[PDB]
Amino acid sequence: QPEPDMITIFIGTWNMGNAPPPKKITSWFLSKGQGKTRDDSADYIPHDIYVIGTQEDPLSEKEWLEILKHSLQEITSVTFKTVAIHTLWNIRIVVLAKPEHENRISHICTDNVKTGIANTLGNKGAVGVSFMFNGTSLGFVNSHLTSGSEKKLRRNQNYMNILRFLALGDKKLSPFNITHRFTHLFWFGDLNYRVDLPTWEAETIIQKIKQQQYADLLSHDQLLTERREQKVFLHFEEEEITFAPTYRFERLTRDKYAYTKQKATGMKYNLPSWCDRVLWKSYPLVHVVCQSYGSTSDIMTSDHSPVFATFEAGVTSQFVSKNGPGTVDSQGQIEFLRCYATLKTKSQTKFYLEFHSSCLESFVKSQEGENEEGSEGELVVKFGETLPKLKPIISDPEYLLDQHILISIKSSDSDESYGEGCIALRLEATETQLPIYTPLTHHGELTGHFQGEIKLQTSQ
Numbered sequence: 001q002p003e004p005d006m007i008t009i010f011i012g013t014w015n016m017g018n019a020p021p022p023k024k025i026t027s028w029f030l031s032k033g034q035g036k037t038r039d040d041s042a043d044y045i046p047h048d049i050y051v052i053g054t055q056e057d058p059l060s061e062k063e064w065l066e067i068l069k070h071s072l073q074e075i076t077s078v079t080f081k082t083v084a085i086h087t088l089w090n091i092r093i094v095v096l097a098k099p100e101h102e103n104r105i106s107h108i109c110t111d112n113v114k115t116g117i118a119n120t121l122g123n124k125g126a127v128g129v130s131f132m133f134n135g136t137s138l139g140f141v142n143s144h145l146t147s148g149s150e151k152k153l154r155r156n157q158n159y160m161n162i163l164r165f166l167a168l169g170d171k172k173l174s175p176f177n178i179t180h181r182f183t184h185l186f187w188f189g190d191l192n193y194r195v196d197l198p199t200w201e202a203e204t205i206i207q208k209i210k211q212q213q214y215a216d217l218l219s220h221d222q223l224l225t226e227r228r229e230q231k232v233f234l235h236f237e238e239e240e241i242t243f244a245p246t247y248r249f250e251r252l253t254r255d256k257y258a259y260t261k262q263k264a265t266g267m268k269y270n271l272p273s274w275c276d277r278v279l280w281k282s283y284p285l286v287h288v289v290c291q292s293y294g295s296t297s298d299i300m301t302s303d304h305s306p307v308f309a310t311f312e313a314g315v316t317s318q319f320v321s322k323n324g325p326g327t328v329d330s331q332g333q334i335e336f337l338r339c340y341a342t343l344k345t346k347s348q349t350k351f352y353l354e355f356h357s358s359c360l361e362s363f364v365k366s367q368e369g370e371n372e373e374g375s376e377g378e379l380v381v382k383f384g385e386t387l388p389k390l391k392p393i394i395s396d397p398e399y400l401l402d403q404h405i406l407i408s409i410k411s412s413d414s415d416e417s418y419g420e421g422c423i424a425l426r427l428e429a430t431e432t433q434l435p436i437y438t439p440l441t442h443h444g445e446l447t448g449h450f451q452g453e454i455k456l457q458t459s460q
């Protein structure tokens with residue numbers, strides 16, 4: 001049986017509004033309703049992995065597992081295996097996989113982050129799951145962020161606390177947060193970003209929704225505008241939104257948005273909004289294609305509609321050679337030429353590089369670079385031709401060109417990372433000097449740039 005080079009992943013996010021679901025929710029797992037929907041011809045074809053994120057979920061893990069497994073069995077005739085389930089308060093993530101993937105899945109991690117202090121600590125945060133699928137690392141985050149049109153800054157803060165403190169993936173990758181630990185990272189949930197228009201425009205907004213004219217609404221979506229100003233979800237992607245706002249509905253219909261202020265809303269308006277979202281971040285030059293992004297029309301127990309997204313995602317096999325794993329393969333090497341880091345830091349310490357990759361037996365520390373002043377105030381750390389020669393465990397190009405090198409630039413004084421990035425080894429040529437580039441981030445904020453040239457030697 002050949003190992004897959006592609007899998008499909010279902011992502012669901014649903015704020016259940018503390019109500020039990022209706023008896024049928026199959027439309028969710030089938031990507032049927034509004035937006036980018038899945039072809040009817042695919043309805044009996046199971047996804048490889050289903051990742052279900054709920055918020056305001058009133059169910060026990062057992063009650064939800066029963067409904068999810070029975071739903072997928074009715075659709076696919078497959079009894080899915082439970083990879084992981086993790087609940088923080090009423091925030092839940094479930095990961096289900098086809099039985100044939102049981103022995104492809106390992107290194108399962110779960111964690112949660114609680115956001116807010118005192119007042120604001122008590123019900124918002126995130127749950128996450130990671131695991132290996134053969135040679136590919138996968139991370140999944142379900143977050144319920146701060147509510148309210150006037151709290152987009154709080155939401156961005158919630159996001160930064162979640163990506164700093166969620167402890168998923170390989171702990172040996174210690175300079176790296178979850179935005180660098182995975183081949184593919186999927187971040188979804190009730191992110192609670194709103195359509196930022198005046199309250200007096202509520203009926204206009206509804207009119208525009210009834211005409212399926214979303215352009216003028218999405219131009220005011222706080223998540224899109226905050227992402228465009230690099231305030232949140234830097235280097236993440238989201239499929240174009242072609243479905244109606246998923247919040248806030250009157251329960252037991254989809255014919256009405258409930259937007260007016262009420263005691264039950266803390267006297268806040270809830271203008272129709274895309275609260276419920278799916279974003280992703282994959283390593284450079286890895287196959288990932290969104291095949292669906294939409295909302296259901298026929299699940300009305302909550303004041304939110306469920307959101308689905310599906311993805312084709314590139315995966316690799318668990319590679320074994322005569323040499324590595326367990327030794328180096330002298331026929332392989334990774335060399336860096338003319339490398340320099342540009343950092344935004346106002347500080348003056350020496351810096352060195354750390355290279356981390358599963359193609360190395362362990363992480364490599366470079367010599368300190370030479371600090372120079374850039375022509376516009378910046379710190380430029382020059383490595384020149386001084387960076388070590390990296391010794392991959394396997395030289396076969398079918399393995400090595402599919403790998404990535406994570407880079408941290410660290411203070412000699414503190415050994416704290418000032419930036420993190422990632423370089424694909426999917427080069428246009430081997431044994432050829434080629435340009436490489438990554439932005440550098442710390443706590444998911446832009447801190448600099450790493451560029452230079454690479455020279456990759458494989459066994460071919």
Ligand SMILES: CC(=O)N1CCN(c2ccc(Cl)cc2)CC1
Nearest residue numbers: 081082083097101102103105108
């Ligand atoms: C030794 C042990 O108890 N575990 C628990 C979780 N295991 C698991 C792997 C794949 C799938 Cl689909 C489901 C579950 C592996 C490790």
